[PDB]
């Protein structure tokens, strides 16, 4: 595949913006200081600022002396340039308002979707570019208290389910400060207090502190009403950026970062590449300044050959090997396709039987239930003589939407599973079910040694085969089978590729305390042949500082693997994580580098960045010294592809770090590692699964080391 030119969401900045004289200093924080002083922050800890104006701050500061722009490291030049763009009126506040002139806030139910732009500066080859990235916030139109019908229980019920993404904006504050509710460490239990004295004080705090006038007070009571002493106070910390604030549900509205996370809404937040291109152009043409280009930049990208997309194949019982990418007399049979695995966990050799549960959501239409039971029966058949092509059925119907039905389901299954090692559940559920109810049904069935596979009403009504409405699309069937097999540790595919590593390891850092545990994170391992072989928990001691002893974390990784039948000693590994490899993580990796003579290759894998290429095709390009890679297209879903950002690569030998450079080879490694999705209806497989597992541990999933020892993705 040749190259191509694609437009990106960057607009070149005029060098005339670069400051004449910069003043340095040493020590409404240090950041606000610099900011108000039209300057930035050179050194975090040392408290070192760099302003472009004479610092006004009668305080503990030492004037180090003027500095020239060329002296600041790139990051600071860019950060400094950013601050300077703001002074010329080019900032998120302003451009977000311009955006909303063409893309207005839309209300859905009790929620409002608010468009705005996220701005940053990127220095690319001696030049600075402003990245303007369109984003959305989903803010509730009703206060949290109103939203939960002023019921204490229903309230605690809210903070719990939405715990992972919930934010609360104090609409009663002139600053509209956003907060994050606090939760009792290692629990879904939100920090609360029904002490009316706390409620009164803080409700009163607002009026006294911001609406001290009669009209203002009128407005306040008109808007918020009296103090509902029946509401508990919610303990919280700022979301921005150890210190806790009290929030009153009656005065806070729940908010969410759309991108960080409902059909309706989703159809509004997803924008086509041309829609983003256009909206940015509309904003630019509304920007009154030649301090930035009038048009979006174009860059040369490397297209990714379609061949590199067929290196993963599956085969049938005959000799038919085909790349995971998709008349005969038998095409009338509902029989699921046949897949001949390349490897099957040795566990299935001893195992006697395997109970098969068909759990039907009673809320689904009878014909939908009937359809699902037939689909699953066919799936189980292919499931079998797939698990042993190289060498019982209980139907449960309950209201999967009520807590009472989920209980009866788990009990009825528990009943049949007593005495058995492994069980399987095929569940048909209405789309109404929350993630929570799905996660609970799944986790509760696993405590009973039952792996499960959910198929929702949607898939059942819009994915039928063109020639047989009483059968699922061949595409979907294959993917259902791949999912189940992956959940069972089956190597059902083969990769025409070899990683130049011993093992590729994805780690996740996430503190959790488990009944006899106290776990700091997770790690998942893939061999050079591209298969998942080990999924381990990473237990640690009660951490000292407010950080995590990564040295202990990584040392336990090796030890825990050595215990799982894998010794990383004198081996070369590619270690990845979700995000930038932090300093502590680097040191931790150097430590484990000498202590076991391990050649560690690592780099930043960033999925949360604003750079966007307004083209829907596989590609990669160098921008600002980092690599941006779009591993796959989009065929059904609306939207703009999100690149995976690759950067700050290093090699670690005997505790020594050698900053490196990313090669087309590295990009190919992430690419293939990313192509491994296991038929899921964005991140490299290793990293993605470490995260799913770190999530399973924090949700109380049982930890079957028998299963994880052979890569069962039973929690995924």
XYZ file of C-alpha atoms in Angstrom:
716
model
C 0.000 0.000 0.000
C 1.235 3.429 -1.070
C 0.925 6.550 1.068
C -1.793 9.175 1.187
C -2.593 12.675 2.322
C -5.151 13.094 5.065
C -6.521 16.150 6.824
C -6.038 16.161 10.602
C -7.542 18.389 13.312
C -4.410 20.578 13.544
C -3.997 24.155 12.335
C -0.508 25.664 12.110
C 0.419 28.505 14.488
C 2.273 31.656 13.460
C 5.789 31.953 14.895
C 5.186 35.640 15.463
C 3.400 34.307 18.531
C 6.629 33.069 20.093
C 7.435 35.351 23.090
C 10.241 37.919 23.062
C 11.368 37.655 26.697
C 10.529 34.974 29.268
C 11.139 35.424 33.002
C 11.907 32.468 35.290
C 11.049 32.186 38.986
C 11.281 29.688 41.859
C 9.146 29.042 44.947
C -4.806 30.046 43.273
C -1.820 27.695 43.087
C 1.525 27.789 41.285
C -0.374 27.022 38.081
C -2.888 29.849 38.499
C 0.093 32.021 39.336
C 1.929 31.390 36.094
C -1.350 31.434 34.177
C -2.447 34.842 35.431
C 1.131 35.886 34.705
C 0.733 34.579 31.132
C 3.324 31.889 31.732
C 3.739 28.213 32.556
C 5.458 25.824 34.967
C 9.005 24.645 34.225
C 9.589 22.184 37.080
C 6.713 20.543 39.028
C 8.263 19.643 42.402
C 10.945 22.353 42.514
C 8.120 24.875 41.996
C 9.731 26.567 38.988
C 7.680 28.916 36.802
C 8.334 30.626 33.453
C 6.340 33.784 32.729
C 6.203 36.213 29.784
C 5.354 39.166 32.033
C 6.891 40.604 35.198
C 5.677 38.221 37.915
C 3.192 39.886 40.251
C 3.196 37.796 43.415
C 4.336 39.265 46.731
C 5.534 35.931 48.076
C 8.235 33.322 48.650
C 9.851 33.504 45.201
C 13.375 33.800 43.819
C 13.873 35.546 40.459
C 16.169 33.091 38.672
C 16.482 35.312 35.601
C 15.281 35.789 32.016
C 15.280 32.841 29.599
C 14.975 32.512 25.818
C 12.208 30.451 24.234
C 14.690 28.193 22.423
C 15.872 27.082 25.871
C 12.604 25.527 27.108
C 12.124 21.850 26.223
C 9.549 21.187 23.506
C 6.716 20.379 25.927
C 7.151 23.755 27.642
C 7.434 25.633 24.369
C 4.145 24.035 23.354
C 2.603 24.600 26.780
C 3.879 28.145 26.684
C 2.570 28.630 23.121
C -0.785 27.266 24.262
C -0.977 29.797 27.092
C -0.136 32.498 24.556
C -2.823 31.410 22.112
C -5.291 31.948 24.938
C -4.161 35.551 25.394
C -5.001 36.229 21.758
C -8.501 34.951 22.435
C -7.863 31.462 21.076
C -8.886 29.230 23.966
C -11.275 26.396 24.788
C -13.826 28.767 26.275
C -14.053 30.864 23.116
C -13.721 28.147 20.460
C -16.206 25.980 22.354
C -18.694 28.809 22.018
C -17.943 29.116 18.321
C -18.472 25.346 17.977
C -21.874 25.558 19.602
C -22.900 28.028 16.916
C -22.991 25.131 14.456
C -23.353 22.138 16.768
C -25.905 23.105 19.395
C -26.564 21.347 22.722
C -29.187 18.687 22.349
C -31.407 17.392 25.116
C -32.290 13.703 25.424
C -34.608 12.734 28.265
C -33.384 14.409 31.426
C -29.950 14.896 29.913
C -28.238 17.494 27.789
C -25.352 16.801 25.426
C -22.995 19.775 25.387
C -20.438 20.091 22.576
C -17.159 21.878 23.222
C -13.579 21.568 22.012
C -10.483 20.303 23.757
C -7.355 22.234 22.696
C -3.672 21.478 22.917
C -0.437 22.387 21.143
C 1.888 19.987 19.388
C 5.351 20.871 18.222
C 6.090 19.072 14.972
C 9.438 19.615 13.317
C 10.343 23.150 14.431
C 6.672 24.171 14.019
C 3.813 24.474 16.511
C 0.274 23.273 15.766
C -2.984 23.784 17.611
C -5.055 20.652 17.926
C -8.774 21.430 18.081
C -10.690 18.291 19.098
C -14.487 18.189 19.357
C -15.899 16.565 22.476
C -19.140 16.239 24.399
C -20.354 16.322 27.976
C -23.634 14.747 29.034
C -25.043 16.773 31.905
C -28.243 15.953 33.747
C -30.932 18.614 33.574
C -32.299 17.564 36.953
C -30.378 17.759 40.222
C -29.130 14.483 41.627
C -31.668 14.613 44.498
C -34.576 15.242 42.115
C -33.200 12.656 39.708
C -33.472 9.937 42.350
C -36.878 11.050 43.595
C -35.454 12.233 46.911
C -35.056 8.650 48.110
C -31.924 7.944 50.229
C -31.797 4.325 49.065
C -32.343 5.186 45.404
C -29.605 7.789 45.821
C -27.009 5.404 47.175
C -28.238 3.126 44.396
C -27.168 5.791 41.907
C -23.617 6.544 43.086
C -22.950 2.797 43.039
C -23.941 1.839 39.493
C -22.553 5.018 37.891
C -19.502 5.003 40.197
C -16.912 4.581 37.434
C -17.798 7.635 35.363
C -20.075 9.782 37.533
C -19.089 13.348 38.193
C -21.190 15.954 39.925
C -21.332 19.602 38.956
C -22.313 22.077 41.658
C -24.843 24.099 39.691
C -25.417 26.092 42.886
C -21.877 27.422 42.701
C -21.064 30.433 40.520
C -17.950 28.453 39.595
C -19.920 25.340 38.572
C -17.092 23.275 40.054
C -17.145 19.586 39.094
C -16.520 16.897 41.715
C -16.036 13.122 41.988
C -18.018 11.243 44.634
C -15.921 9.382 47.229
C -16.312 5.668 47.832
C -15.104 3.558 50.741
C -11.856 2.181 49.296
C -12.250 -1.300 47.826
C -16.046 -0.909 47.867
C -19.037 0.170 45.769
C -20.208 1.816 49.006
C -20.345 5.642 48.583
C -19.248 7.843 51.508
C -22.392 9.317 53.077
C -23.761 11.005 56.220
C -27.377 11.707 57.073
C -26.314 14.250 59.700
C -28.689 17.157 58.995
C -26.137 19.438 60.604
C -23.821 18.797 57.653
C -26.629 19.298 55.151
C -27.755 22.566 56.737
C -24.277 24.033 57.131
C -23.257 23.500 53.510
C -26.641 24.423 52.030
C -26.334 27.585 54.054
C -22.727 27.959 53.023
C -23.854 28.451 49.405
C -26.397 31.180 50.077
C -24.164 33.077 52.492
C -21.137 32.663 50.225
C -22.613 33.371 46.775
C -26.224 34.620 46.870
C -26.173 37.026 49.819
C -28.864 39.305 48.321
C -32.690 39.138 48.591
C -33.246 38.612 44.854
C -30.344 36.183 44.637
C -31.868 34.280 47.563
C -35.270 34.417 45.886
C -33.720 32.852 42.786
C -31.944 30.234 44.900
C -35.094 29.017 46.635
C -36.984 29.300 43.347
C -34.294 27.169 41.724
C -33.312 24.767 44.500
C -36.028 25.139 47.146
C -35.685 24.708 50.910
C -33.131 22.352 52.438
C -34.370 18.791 52.253
C -32.965 17.624 55.586
C -33.848 14.110 54.471
C -30.964 14.029 52.002
C -27.582 12.653 53.044
C -24.438 14.655 52.357
C -22.070 13.195 49.740
C -18.358 13.257 50.527
C -16.305 14.242 47.499
C -12.990 15.434 46.084
C -12.436 17.818 43.162
C -12.462 16.119 39.777
C -9.925 18.553 38.307
C -6.106 18.544 38.498
C -5.993 14.495 50.362
C -8.863 17.000 50.662
C -12.607 16.378 50.809
C -15.699 18.522 50.229
C -19.335 17.905 51.089
C -21.914 17.960 48.338
C -25.686 18.093 48.614
C -27.529 16.035 45.965
C -30.167 18.749 45.933
C -27.554 21.140 44.562
C -25.478 18.946 42.209
C -26.280 17.571 38.752
C -24.581 14.455 37.471
C -22.180 14.931 34.550
C -20.182 12.718 32.201
C -17.460 12.960 29.533
C -19.227 11.417 26.510
C -16.025 10.078 24.997
C -15.061 8.487 28.323
C -18.244 6.419 28.493
C -27.427 5.315 25.171
C -28.416 4.837 21.508
C -30.110 8.232 21.178
C -27.203 10.184 22.686
C -24.511 8.077 21.037
C -26.045 8.887 17.643
C -25.362 12.560 18.385
C -21.873 12.389 19.898
C -20.438 10.213 17.133
C -19.503 12.475 14.227
C -18.470 11.417 10.734
C -14.977 12.501 9.588
C -16.490 15.070 7.243
C -18.752 16.441 9.945
C -15.756 17.035 12.264
C -13.754 18.467 9.360
C -16.547 20.894 8.532
C -17.318 21.990 12.097
C -13.663 22.802 12.649
C -13.582 24.792 9.437
C -16.719 26.636 10.589
C -14.980 27.521 13.843
C -11.817 28.664 12.095
C -13.674 30.916 9.684
C -15.311 32.449 12.749
C -11.937 32.993 14.429
C -10.819 36.577 13.846
C -7.026 36.245 13.904
C -4.214 35.458 11.502
C -2.260 34.113 14.480
C -3.348 30.662 13.207
C -3.981 29.187 9.743
C -7.391 29.500 8.126
C -7.373 25.840 7.120
C -6.804 22.405 8.609
C -3.401 20.803 8.038
C -2.828 17.820 5.807
C -0.236 15.157 6.526
C 1.275 12.229 4.684
C 0.266 8.926 6.187
C 1.382 5.366 5.489
C -1.546 3.179 4.448
C -1.604 -0.256 6.035
C -1.650 -3.036 3.423
C -4.836 -5.114 3.535
C -2.626 -8.201 3.712
C -1.470 -7.467 7.283
C -5.161 -7.881 8.069
C -5.356 -11.550 7.146
C -2.561 -12.942 9.264
C -5.062 -14.584 11.627
C -6.877 -17.713 10.436
C -9.400 -20.349 11.555
C -9.921 -23.819 10.038
C -12.709 -26.414 9.822
C -12.570 -30.202 10.286
C -11.487 -30.541 6.657
C -8.442 -28.617 5.461
C -10.223 -25.297 4.974
C -8.080 -22.580 6.602
C -9.543 -19.106 6.192
C -8.500 -15.645 7.450
C -10.882 -14.262 10.077
C -12.724 -12.094 7.537
C -16.214 -12.548 6.093
C -24.713 -22.674 -3.407
C -23.706 -25.555 -1.117
C -26.472 -28.097 -0.507
C -25.969 -28.011 3.280
C -26.431 -24.221 3.534
C -30.005 -24.941 4.665
C -28.923 -26.480 7.961
C -28.956 -24.403 11.149
C -25.761 -26.230 12.152
C -23.239 -23.645 13.334
C -19.997 -23.378 11.388
C -17.278 -25.865 12.282
C -14.033 -24.646 13.785
C -11.031 -26.906 14.280
C -8.979 -25.454 17.165
C -5.169 -25.400 17.027
C -5.056 -25.987 20.789
C -7.545 -26.970 23.511
C -6.756 -26.576 27.243
C -5.585 -29.862 28.699
C -8.241 -29.389 31.378
C -11.026 -30.541 29.045
C -9.400 -33.970 28.755
C -10.297 -35.151 32.268
C -13.575 -33.226 32.676
C -16.614 -35.528 32.605
C -19.688 -33.598 31.479
C -20.421 -29.903 31.050
C -23.906 -28.649 32.006
C -25.502 -26.268 29.461
C -27.904 -23.589 30.732
C -30.244 -21.635 28.484
C -31.232 -18.583 30.513
C -34.134 -16.729 28.865
C -35.114 -13.189 29.819
C -38.850 -13.535 30.544
C -39.305 -10.014 29.255
C -38.426 -11.054 25.733
C -41.278 -11.947 23.360
C -42.033 -15.673 23.244
C -40.904 -15.941 19.623
C -37.612 -14.213 20.573
C -37.028 -16.705 23.392
C -37.801 -19.608 21.078
C -35.396 -18.230 18.494
C -32.589 -17.826 21.050
C -32.941 -21.314 22.502
C -32.582 -22.693 18.977
C -29.556 -20.533 18.213
C -27.794 -21.601 21.406
C -28.554 -25.309 20.907
C -26.758 -25.081 17.600
C -23.945 -23.101 19.222
C -23.451 -25.760 21.915
C -23.256 -28.478 19.248
C -20.427 -26.703 17.431
C -19.034 -25.895 20.881
C -18.738 -29.633 21.299
C -16.701 -31.535 18.722
C -14.640 -28.358 18.722
C -13.449 -28.883 22.264
C -12.872 -32.543 21.438
C -12.541 -32.834 17.655
C -9.103 -34.236 18.431
C -10.271 -36.096 21.552
C -27.593 -31.691 30.407
C -29.595 -28.829 28.880
C -31.535 -26.829 31.430
C -33.789 -24.014 30.239
C -34.341 -21.209 32.730
C -36.727 -18.339 32.178
C -36.801 -15.411 34.610
C -37.091 -11.622 34.684
C -33.429 -10.715 34.138
C -34.386 -7.111 34.803
C -35.562 -7.589 38.397
C -33.176 -8.485 41.239
C -35.510 -11.322 42.241
C -35.166 -13.095 38.891
C -31.385 -12.907 38.864
C -31.406 -14.539 42.298
C -33.727 -17.357 41.180
C -31.498 -17.853 38.120
C -28.334 -18.183 40.189
C -30.150 -20.486 42.635
C -31.612 -22.711 39.945
C -28.172 -22.937 38.319
C -26.417 -23.396 41.662
C -28.747 -26.341 42.141
C -27.665 -28.150 38.949
C -24.010 -27.207 39.234
C -23.335 -28.772 42.614
C -20.742 -31.445 42.058
C -19.638 -30.156 38.647
C -16.359 -28.584 37.551
C -17.468 -26.504 34.587
C -20.787 -25.196 33.357
C -21.965 -23.032 30.449
C -24.706 -20.439 30.190
C -26.167 -18.932 27.045
C -28.279 -15.945 27.979
C -30.879 -14.089 25.941
C -31.504 -10.641 27.443
C -33.515 -7.539 26.547
C -31.430 -4.463 25.727
C -32.955 -2.718 28.798
C -30.610 -4.417 31.263
C -27.940 -2.193 32.724
C -24.255 -3.078 32.561
C -24.599 -3.648 36.291
C -27.262 -6.320 35.941
C -25.298 -7.914 33.110
C -22.063 -7.865 35.145
C -23.847 -9.312 38.193
C -25.605 -12.109 36.321
C -22.285 -13.063 34.744
C -20.159 -12.847 37.891
C -22.699 -14.715 40.046
C -22.845 -17.551 37.564
C -19.085 -17.797 37.541
C -18.853 -18.242 41.319
C -20.645 -21.467 40.364
C -17.987 -22.436 37.790
C -20.249 -21.496 34.881
C -18.779 -19.476 31.998
C -21.376 -17.450 30.128
C -22.281 -15.839 26.836
C -24.885 -13.124 26.477
C -26.753 -12.352 23.280
C -29.081 -9.320 23.457
C -32.486 -8.683 21.898
C -30.879 -6.400 19.337
C -28.587 -9.060 17.923
C -31.556 -11.437 17.864
C -33.825 -9.149 15.864
C -31.461 -7.399 13.416
C -28.770 -9.971 12.686
C -30.794 -12.749 11.103
C -29.508 -14.530 7.981
C -30.722 -13.198 4.618
C -31.969 -16.634 3.558
C -33.295 -17.792 6.943
C -34.922 -15.415 9.423
C -34.826 -18.226 11.975
C -31.057 -18.198 12.055
C -28.328 -15.673 12.956
C -25.964 -14.057 10.440
C -23.022 -16.285 9.589
C -20.832 -13.379 10.626
C -22.417 -13.179 14.071
C -22.421 -16.943 14.565
C -18.699 -17.165 13.931
C -18.132 -14.336 16.384
C -20.302 -15.957 19.060
C -18.260 -19.132 18.748
C -14.947 -17.256 18.917
C -16.094 -15.493 22.064
C -17.080 -18.666 23.867
C -13.869 -20.444 22.847
C -11.754 -17.529 24.022
C -13.599 -17.545 27.349
C -12.515 -21.182 27.619
C -8.846 -20.659 26.774
C -9.095 -22.383 23.395
C -6.498 -21.487 20.778
C -9.033 -21.534 17.951
C -6.967 -19.377 15.616
C -3.442 -19.218 14.222
C -1.334 -16.152 13.542
C 0.874 -15.956 10.461
C 3.363 -13.843 12.367
C 6.099 -13.969 15.008
C 6.829 -11.275 17.585
C 10.532 -10.642 18.113
C 9.959 -11.197 21.818
C 9.721 -14.065 24.282
C 6.445 -12.809 25.720
C 4.342 -9.668 25.266
C 2.990 -8.548 28.613
C 0.127 -6.181 29.362
C -0.103 -4.865 32.936
C -2.761 -2.843 34.755
C -2.366 -0.926 38.008
C -5.483 -0.823 40.173
C -5.539 -1.114 43.988
C -8.035 -3.552 45.504
C -8.401 -5.495 48.769
C -9.829 -8.983 48.390
C -10.907 -11.556 50.981
C -7.395 -12.720 51.833
C -5.574 -10.651 49.237
C -4.991 -6.891 48.939
C -4.278 -6.730 45.189
C -2.448 -3.942 43.390
C -3.148 -4.832 39.784
C -3.013 -7.338 36.945
C -0.865 -8.673 34.122
C -1.717 -10.732 31.068
C 0.751 -12.687 28.957
C 0.948 -13.610 25.283
C 3.655 -15.817 23.777
C 5.559 -14.871 20.600
C 3.099 -17.038 18.651
C 0.378 -14.543 19.581
C -1.535 -16.643 22.111
C -2.697 -15.719 25.592
C -1.083 -18.076 28.055
C -1.213 -16.456 31.505
C -3.570 -14.059 33.328
C -2.252 -13.288 36.836
C -3.372 -11.131 39.773
C -0.643 -9.031 41.326
C -0.873 -9.138 45.094
C 1.065 -6.565 47.092
C 1.436 -5.384 50.665
C -0.320 -2.422 52.267
C 1.345 0.369 50.281
C 3.470 2.914 52.157
C 3.489 6.229 50.314
C 0.556 7.545 48.307
C 2.009 5.771 45.281
C 2.580 2.099 44.523
C 5.865 0.281 44.953
C 6.206 -0.626 41.273
C 9.414 -2.420 42.170
C 7.296 -4.701 44.356
C 4.583 -4.794 41.732
C 6.872 -5.893 38.938
C 8.871 -8.262 41.141
C 5.671 -10.056 42.118
C 4.729 -10.195 38.424
C 7.783 -12.321 37.657
C 7.361 -14.414 40.782
C 3.656 -14.929 40.140
C 4.446 -16.013 36.577
C 7.283 -18.270 37.736
C 4.559 -19.855 39.849
C 2.296 -20.033 36.819
C 4.965 -21.946 34.905
C 6.765 -19.106 33.150
C 10.142 -17.635 34.056
C 10.907 -14.238 32.556
C 14.544 -14.564 33.647
C 17.066 -13.790 30.884
C 14.208 -13.181 28.438
C 13.194 -10.323 26.128
C 9.690 -8.987 26.680
C 7.513 -6.199 25.360
C 5.711 -4.755 28.369
C 2.726 -2.526 27.743
C 0.157 -0.705 29.824
C -2.910 1.495 29.231
C -1.233 4.874 28.931
C 2.111 6.560 29.498
C 4.755 4.465 31.309
C 5.215 6.510 34.493
C 8.561 7.157 36.196
C 7.754 4.749 39.017
C 6.868 2.148 36.425
C 10.144 2.750 34.632
C 12.221 2.334 37.809
C 10.166 -0.698 38.742
C 11.009 -2.166 35.341
C 14.705 -1.356 35.628
C 14.740 -3.063 39.043
C 13.207 -6.232 37.623
C 15.648 -5.856 34.701
C 18.804 -6.515 36.711
C 17.276 -8.746 39.368
C 16.311 -11.219 36.650
C 18.370 -10.054 33.705
C 15.327 -9.120 31.678
C 15.471 -7.174 28.421
C 12.420 -4.945 28.770
C 11.024 -3.158 25.747
C 8.300 -0.724 26.673
C 6.585 2.384 25.322
C 3.581 4.599 25.894
C 0.304 3.290 24.497
C -2.090 6.230 24.596
C -5.750 5.860 23.673
C -6.809 9.098 25.309
C -5.434 11.876 23.178
C -7.170 14.484 20.950
C -5.345 14.022 17.647
C -7.774 12.994 14.882
C -7.327 12.082 11.185
C -10.437 12.836 9.150
C -10.186 9.679 7.082
C -11.709 6.268 7.743
C -8.876 3.865 6.854
C -6.041 1.897 8.454
C -2.881 4.009 8.636
C -0.147 5.490 10.765
C 1.964 8.636 10.721
C 4.541 10.535 12.735
C 3.356 13.667 14.477
C 5.345 15.604 17.044
C 7.616 12.591 17.416
C 4.915 10.124 18.373
C 3.237 7.598 16.117
C -0.502 7.573 15.524
C -2.017 4.309 14.366
C -5.523 3.455 13.132
C -5.562 -0.419 13.326
C -8.947 -0.835 11.613
C -11.780 0.987 9.806
C -15.461 1.254 10.699
C -18.147 -0.334 8.500
C -21.437 -0.038 10.377
C -20.876 2.458 13.184
C -20.889 6.218 12.599
C -17.885 8.169 13.842
C -14.250 9.108 13.384
C -11.583 6.455 14.113
C -9.510 7.033 17.271
C -5.781 6.579 16.755
C -3.610 4.725 19.246
C -0.725 7.059 20.103
C 2.760 5.470 20.418
C 5.591 7.326 22.134
C 8.625 7.604 24.411
C 9.892 4.108 23.678
C 12.803 2.782 25.718
C 14.829 -0.405 26.082
C 15.746 -1.561 29.562
C 18.755 -3.802 30.154
C 20.464 -4.445 33.498
C 18.626 -1.524 35.066
C 19.744 0.795 32.296
C 17.361 2.803 30.127
C 18.072 3.766 26.503
C 15.452 6.141 25.114
C 14.649 4.697 21.697
C 12.866 5.238 18.419
C 9.728 3.523 17.197
C 10.223 1.504 14.016
C 7.795 0.352 11.363
C 8.383 -2.940 13.144
C 7.065 -1.629 16.434
C 4.008 -0.238 14.690
C 3.440 -3.676 13.122
C 3.649 -5.278 16.568
C 1.016 -3.009 18.061
C -1.041 -3.518 14.922
C -1.208 -7.304 15.153
C -1.516 -7.184 18.939
C -4.501 -4.904 18.344
C -6.063 -7.128 15.677
C -6.529 -9.759 18.395
C -10.067 -8.940 19.626
C -11.416 -12.486 19.953
C -14.520 -11.808 17.857
C -15.927 -9.100 20.142
C -19.081 -7.628 18.614
C -9.051 -0.485 20.565
C -5.971 -1.370 22.675
C -3.387 -4.148 22.118
C -4.870 -7.443 23.328
C -2.405 -7.827 26.231
C -3.154 -4.389 27.643
C -6.876 -4.656 26.986
C -7.285 -7.888 28.899
C -5.079 -6.878 31.812
C -7.593 -4.072 32.250
C -10.663 -6.296 31.966
C -9.119 -8.513 34.598
C -8.097 -5.699 36.937
C -11.751 -4.809 36.585
C -12.943 -8.313 37.411
C -10.907 -8.327 40.601
C -12.407 -4.997 41.680
C -15.904 -6.356 41.042
C -15.361 -9.473 43.160
C -15.045 -12.045 40.389
C -13.874 -15.424 41.684
C -10.215 -16.006 40.810
C -9.872 -19.521 39.292
C -6.131 -19.881 38.823
C -6.893 -23.193 37.193
C -8.583 -21.266 34.368
C -6.319 -18.229 34.236
C -3.360 -20.596 34.065
C -4.405 -21.445 30.531
C -5.796 -18.102 29.430
C -9.523 -18.509 30.078
C -10.963 -15.055 29.378
C -13.941 -16.024 31.528
C -14.243 -12.497 32.993
C -14.019 -10.750 29.657
